[PDB]
Structure 1
Amino acid sequence: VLPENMKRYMGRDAQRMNILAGRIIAETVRSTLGPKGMDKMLVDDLGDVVVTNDGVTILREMSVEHPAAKMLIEVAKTQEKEVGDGTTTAVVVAGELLRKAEELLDQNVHPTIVVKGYQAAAQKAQELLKTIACEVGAQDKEILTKIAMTSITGKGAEKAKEKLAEIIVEAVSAVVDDEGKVDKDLIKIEKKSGASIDDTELIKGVLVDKERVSAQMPKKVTDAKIALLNCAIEIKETETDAEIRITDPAKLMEFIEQEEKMLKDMVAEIKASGANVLFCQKGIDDLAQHYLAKEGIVAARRVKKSDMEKLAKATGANVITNIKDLSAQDLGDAGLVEERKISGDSMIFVEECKHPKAVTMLIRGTTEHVIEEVARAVDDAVGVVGCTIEDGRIVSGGGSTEVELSMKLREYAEGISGREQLAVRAFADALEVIPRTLAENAGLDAIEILVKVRAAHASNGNKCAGLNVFTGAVEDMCENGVVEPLRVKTQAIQSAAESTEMLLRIDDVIAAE
């Protein structure tokens, strides 16, 4: 009936294999988690080497077979889309949550009771986080750099978190404009091996990976008047079936000369517009490039639609269809448009925009994998800054949240009573895996840290606690400026608890080959 190779699990075996598959992933990724966490090297079937610490990236790249591990990946991708970071922490706490669910299965607690206490504890956990949430200015320079920096830490880029925090806060502020909505698509991340991270810099405009089409064109244009054409700049022929019908040896020449005039006039109109920089989304015929050079118009063809839009946003250039339609009102401004070589590669830098809606960050470093890690670090840094601008609530780090939750959810458990108290107690205890693996990976005593931190948390509070693995002792995360967006923590609770309830609800898995 069934293909040899097909695997199927059901009842107790489905639940065991699903809890295992999820926790197995969590076991793999948790060794990267934290300031003292390590990195993974995944090399595909072609030799392509991926060196990263990002959990979701590891999950996307690695070869997963079990359906349960594949659903955990979907959770990781949601966390990636929403906030970027906190993916690993979502997997780990979910892995333990399943571990504790297995303890409840060992206790013969019916799956509907387990998920009942989890649903209850998760609802209260959300209320608790919103209660302890510290409100900050959405555009406050200070907290903007504090959120940025704490995000950057635990990465290779932390060594330069000061320059990066400035770059990312400035980049987001430049493109966000009003108060507000933050669109990460407005910040282009360019990465080019060569130099070091000290050379990484923000360019108020757009870095175009194109060259000056003619040797006769200027190499740099100041106070640039930029035009954006989406049509191809070639000798246009009608869509309809047509051909030249020669009537005289003179006319053979008249037709060729006529076509030369057509294309010459086109360029004459571009010049008449006041344009001196031109970007065409489609191709530009060499003959057109020949005429463009005559008027000193610098040009780049075959430009990506994405960059044509970044140019429109940054320069305020208006995309125009017909060259005859191009007017001064369509032209955008750039302080300087200049052709520059970066580690040999010739690019056109459009910089010093008046009021840019797009910004480009050029990342340098000694190796591709280094600038790739920096690219991931700053992607998350921008993400979490956007999270704190849109949602002006932050919370203390160093595991203070999860500890605060385990405190109040333990008392909540006692209030509930019955078999629900067992499930709620298990949920609250599951949250301690994060503080636990933070210290374990830090090389700190797992037991003594957890006892001292919880004691300090209960006595002094959640704004007077958490673990500072940097000095290797319990400290005050809040006063030390160790804070993260509320959204990170609240989204983790929601998605993890609901996807866990799903896994726990599945009692029959059929995996065809």
Structure 2
Amino acid sequence: VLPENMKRYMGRDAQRMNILAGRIIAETVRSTLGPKGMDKMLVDDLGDVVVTNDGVTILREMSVEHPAAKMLIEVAKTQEKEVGDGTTTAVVVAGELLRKAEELLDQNVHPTIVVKGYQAAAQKAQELLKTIACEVGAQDKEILTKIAMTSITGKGAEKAKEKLAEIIVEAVSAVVDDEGKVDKDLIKIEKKSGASIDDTELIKGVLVDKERVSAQMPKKVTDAKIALLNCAIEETASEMLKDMVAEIKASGANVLFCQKGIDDLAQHYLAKEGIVAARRVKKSDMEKLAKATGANVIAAIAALSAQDLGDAGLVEERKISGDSMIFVEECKHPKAVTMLIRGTTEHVIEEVARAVDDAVGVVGCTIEDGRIVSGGGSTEVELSMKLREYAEGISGREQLAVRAFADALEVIPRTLAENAGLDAIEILVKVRAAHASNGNKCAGLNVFTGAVEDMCENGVVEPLRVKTQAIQSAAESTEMLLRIDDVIAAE
């Protein structure tokens, strides 16, 4: 019935193969887990080199075959869209979840027991997270910089994590408006090789990666009237093109951003009128300019009026590491800011660009969700303690699946210690004992000194969403995977 070459796995082989595929992914990423994680190098079919420690980037760039590895990739992408971080963590948890679950399937325990047990344990784990959750101010400067800096650490950018947190916290508060929703488009991430990471700074306005289209145009314009046109400024014959220039001038425009091209004939007439112009402007840049300046993007040149013009206090052409760029600054009430990232090499400022991708993310998460929890494996250990007691209350065979889930949470503090170069046996014993005796905000592992410490005292906390999202995504992913008992794949 089926074509020769089609392959099929079933029962124990389907489940082992599928868990194996997910395990291979977990094996790849688990060595990036934590501040003391290492970097991977991915080289494509063309020779292009991608160096990273991000689970999503790694999973997006690598080309897997097995559906299970493809599902973990898609889960990692959702994790990025929602939280940003917790990617590698969730994969490692999901891997251990399947490892634990396989022992039950191998023991001939009906799949419905494992699934139901995980549904119960995951529901109780999130309830426990809400119980330990600490309420903090959505706009508290202190916790904003603590979340920010904590996220930054373990990265190359940690050198200037204080300057970066200061930029990111102020940038979000500026653009977030109400309490609140922050748009990542309102905090522009610009990077240019040169100087150090310490020279990275925040620009109260918009930096456009364009130059003054003519040498004869002014290089500095004050009290600027910004025009946004997407129609190319090219008309046959000089008189006809000059008419267009006169129409732009008539509106009172002093600074002109054209999405398409500007013919040399128009550039000369624009220069005569003292109107500065930049062509080939990116659609994104036209939008950021419209938002900040209050300029209205106009289709037809004829349609541009004075009421469509935006305001900027100063528009000036400056060279950054030699390259000419236009600074739109000193606006009355800008709605967008720009973060100019500096550093010794392109690869460094790319790492910083990712670092601040996460930093601005988690600060936004802290504003929207005023619940945080202790880090350093404190949650997962607290969950092990409480879910073990829950398991005892539950009883039957279901308590074994819940016991496996609760114990599976230990993979995180265990792998964190491995990457830190710590003796996991000594860590797990001393941390667990210290956790049970002193508490959840009086423990955890500090990988930076390589010993059990007080995570709360040191400001080592993570947004509640990280931990609760990890449960939702991971539990649903491994639950689905467990449900498949027969894989039929065409060649």
Settle same-fold status: TM greater than 0.5. yes
* Contact map agreement 1:283 1:302 (CA 8 A) in 2: yes
Q: Displacement, 1:142?
A: 1.3
Deviation at residue 314 of structure 1 after TM alignment: 1.7
**Distance across 2 between alignment mates of 1:60 and 1:209:** 28
Corresponding position: 1:267 with 2:238: no
Q: More deviation in 84-93 or 284-293?
A: 284-293
Moved more, 157-166 or 180-189: 180-189
SS of the aligned residue for 2:487 comes to: strand
Deviation at 1:389, TM superposition (A): 0.9
In structure 1, what is the Cα distance between the partners aligned to 2:298 and 2:21? Answer: 54
CA contact (8 A) 1:25 1:69 kept: yes
Q: Deviations over 1:460-505 (max 9, x none)?
A: 2111111111122211112211111111110010010011000000
Aligned length: 491
Farther-moved stretch of structure 1 (289-298 vs 186-195): 186-195
Which residue of the partner structure matches residue 156 of structure 1? Answer: 156
Per-residue deviation, residues 373-393 of structure 1 (Å, max 9, x unmatched)? 111111011111111111111
Distance across 1 between alignment mates of 2:16 and 2:332: 61
| CA distance in structure 2 between the aligned counterparts of 1:198 and 1:7, rounded to whole angstroms | 56
C-alpha spacing 1:258/1:207, structure 2 compared with 1 (3 Å): closer
Deviation at 1:152, TM superposition (A): 0.5
SS at the partner of 1:306? helix
Q: What whole-Å deviation, never above 9, does each CA across 1:152-185 have from its counterpart, x for those lacking one?
A: 1111111110111011111211211111112222
Shift of 1:346: 2.3
Of the candidates 307, 317, 320, which is equivalent to residue 329 of structure 1?
Answer: 307
Which secondary structure state, in structure 1, belongs to the residue aligned with residue 168 of structure 2? helix
Tell me the alpha carbon deviations over residues 424-451 of structure 1, each in whole angstroms, 9 at most, x when there is no partner: 0000000010011111111111011111
Secondary structure of the residue aligned to 2:314 is: strand
1:390-440 Cα offsets, whole Å, 9 max, x none, are: 111111111111111111111111110000000000000000100111111
Matched-pair contact (CA < 8 Å) for 1:67–1:511: no
Tell me what 2:209 maps to.
209
Q: Deviations over 1:305-335 (max 9, x none)?
A: 1111101112222223444543443222223
In 2, the alpha carbon distance for the partners of 1:106 and 1:60 equals 32
State the distance in 2 between where 1:511 and 1:89 align. Answer: 30
Offset of residue 195 of structure 1: 2.3
For the residue of structure 1 that corresponds to 2:391, the secondary structure is helix
Larger deviation, residues 411-420 vs 465-474: 465-474
SS in 1 for 2:256: strand
Once the 2 structures are TM-superposed, how far is the Cα of residue 285 of structure 1 from its aligned partner? Answer: 2.1
Between 353-362 and 113-122, the greater mean CA deviation after superposition: 353-362
Instruction: Indicate the residue corresponding to 1:244 in structure 2.
Output: none
- The alignment status of 1:471 with 2:470, answered yes or no, reads no
Shift of 1:267: 2.0
Query: What are the superposed Cα offsets for residues 17-49 of structure 1, whole Å, 9 maximum, x if unpaired?
Result: 111111111111111111111000111111111
**Is contact 1:270-1:323 (8 Å) kept?**
yes
Question: Do the aligned partners of 1:136 and 1:393 also contact (CA within 8 Å) in 2?
Answer: yes
In structure 2, do the counterparts of structure 1 residues 258 and 15 end up closer, same or farther at CA, with 3 Å as the change threshold?
Answer: closer
Query: Do the aligned partners of residues 399 and 225 (structure 1) sit closer, same or farther apart at CA in structure 2, a change above 3 Å counting?
Result: same
Alignment partners' CA distance in 2, 1:334 and 1:5: 66
TM-score by length of 1: 0.92
> For residues 63 and 236 of structure 2, what CA distance do their matches in structure 1 show?
62
Superposition RMSD in Å: 1.8
User: 1:508 Cα deviation (Å)?
Assistant: 1.4
Answer whether contact 1:41 1:52 (CA < 8 A) is retained. Answer: yes
Q: Distance in 2 between matches of 1:464 and 1:258?
A: 76
Q: Deviations over 1:248-281 (max 9, x none)?
A: xxxxxxxxx9954443233223223222111112
TM-score w.r.t. the length of structure 2 is: 0.96
Tell whether the 8 Å contact from 1:182 to 1:390 is kept in structure 2 after alignment: no
Residues 476/5 of structure 1: CA separation in 2 closer, same or farther (3 Å cut): farther
Q: Which runs of 5+ in 1 are unaligned?
A: 235-256
Quote the residue 2:278 is aligned against: 300
1:278·1:298 contact (CA, 8 Å) conserved in 2?
A: yes
- Secondary structure at the aligned position of 1:5 is classed as coil
Q: How far is 1:286 from its partner?
A: 1.9
Tell me which moved more, 433-442 or 270-279.
Answer: 270-279
Identify if the C-alpha distance between structure 1 residues 455 and 206 changes in structure 2 by more than 3 Å, giving closer, same or farther: same
- The answer for unaligned runs of 5 or more in structure 2 is none
Alignment of 1:174-253 (within 5 A): 174-234=174-234
Deviation at 1:6, TM superposition (A): 4.2
User: 2:115 matched to 1:137?
Assistant: no
Give the conservation status (yes or no) of the 8 Å contact 1:37–1:442.
yes
Contact in 2 for aligned 1:276/1:297 (Cα 8 Å) = yes
Q: Which shifted more, 341-350 or 202-211? A: 341-350
Structure 2 CA distance for aligned equivalents of residues 438 and 198 of structure 1: 29
In the aligned structure 2, how far is the partner of 1:348 from the partner of 1:473? 50
Q: Is the 8 A contact 1:8 1:510 kept in 2?
A: yes
Alignment of 1:284-299 (within 5 A): 284-299=262-277
Q: Identity over the aligned pairs, expressed in percent?
A: 98
Greater shift, 41-50 or 316-325, is seen at: 316-325
Q: Which residue of 2 aligns with 1:283?
A: 261
Q: What SS class does the counterpart of residue 278 from structure 1 fall into? A: strand
The 8 Å contact of residues 50 and 369 in structure 1, kept in 2 or not, is answered as no
**What's the offset of the Cα at 1:201?**
1.7
Tell me how far 1:11 sits from its aligned partner: 0.9
Runs (4 or more) in structure 1 with deviation over 6 Å come to: none
Deviates more, 1:47-56 or 1:465-474: 465-474
Q: Which moved more, 1:70-79 or 1:4-13?
A: 4-13
Q: Is the CA contact (8 Å cut-off) linking 1:463 and 1:476 kept in structure 2?
A: yes
> In the TM superposition, what is the alpha-carbon distance from 1:119 to its structure 2 partner?
0.3
Q: Against the structure 1 CA distance between its residues 452 and 258, is the aligned structure 2 distance closer, same or farther, given a 3 Å change threshold?
A: closer
Deviation at 1:209, TM superposition (A): 1.8
SS at match of 2:303: coil
Matching of residues 32-181 of structure 1 within 5 Å: 32-181=32-181
**Separation of aligned partners in 2, 1:29 and 1:3:** 36
SS at match of 2:236: helix
Change beyond 3 A, Cα 1:440–1:332: same
Cα separation, 1, equivalents of 2:452 and 2:345 = 36
Paired residues of 1:193 and 1:371 also in contact (CA < 8 A): yes
Aligned equivalents of 2:376 and 2:307: distance in 1?
Answer: 54
What's the CA shift string for 1:100-132, capped at 9, x where partnerless?
011212322111100110000000011111111
* Residue 372 to residue 512, structure 1, CA distance change in 2 (3 Å): farther
Write the distance in 1 (CA, Å) between the matches of 2:346 and 2:236.
51
When structure 1 is superposed on structure 2, of 56-65 and 487-496 the one drifting more is 56-65
Report the secondary structure of 2:216's partner residue. Answer: coil
Seen in structure 2, the aligned counterparts of structure 1 residues 6 and 162 have a Cα distance that, compared at 3 Å, is: farther
Change (3 A) 1:475 1:509: same
What displacement does 1:205 show?
A: 1.8
